[PDB]
Amino acid sequence: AQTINLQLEGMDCTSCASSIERAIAKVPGVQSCQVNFALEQAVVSYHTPQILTDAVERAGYHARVL
Template identity: 40%
Template sequence: MELIASSQAIKSTEKANFDGFYLGDQAMKTSYLKLDGLMCDGCSEIIERATQKLPGVRRCQVNLDLERAEIEYDPQLMSLETIQKALKGVGYSAEPINETNHLTE
């Protein structure tokens, strides 16, 4: 059995999604969505949980004040349209934001 450093193990697990398969960084895409219908931290949690259950979604971070979500996902396993449909299914509309202007829109 080969032993590895704990820091290497942590990095490996951080790059695995909930199913435990590796999602190489080069395959990941980050998209930004303008969210409609956010009212509280509970809304943010619902959105984060709903997206993180989707195959290929590595991370979702919601900014309640800006009504935006930053979603990191593997486009070979998940499409932005499917993420939008999942959010609509839990009661929120989400429209893509131009990735180069996401900080100023």
């Protein structure tokens, strides 16, 4: 698995973190996604990174590959 780190913008509450996690986990091949709420970052283990940023954008939040 490859590790992809994302900066996240637009999170207001811990339920924004679980929403972003759900959105990313819906992408086939994601083997783990954990959003660090305080760091406003996602750590994704994936089996291009732009499919992951699009999952976040489609869920209503901004992501950027780090």
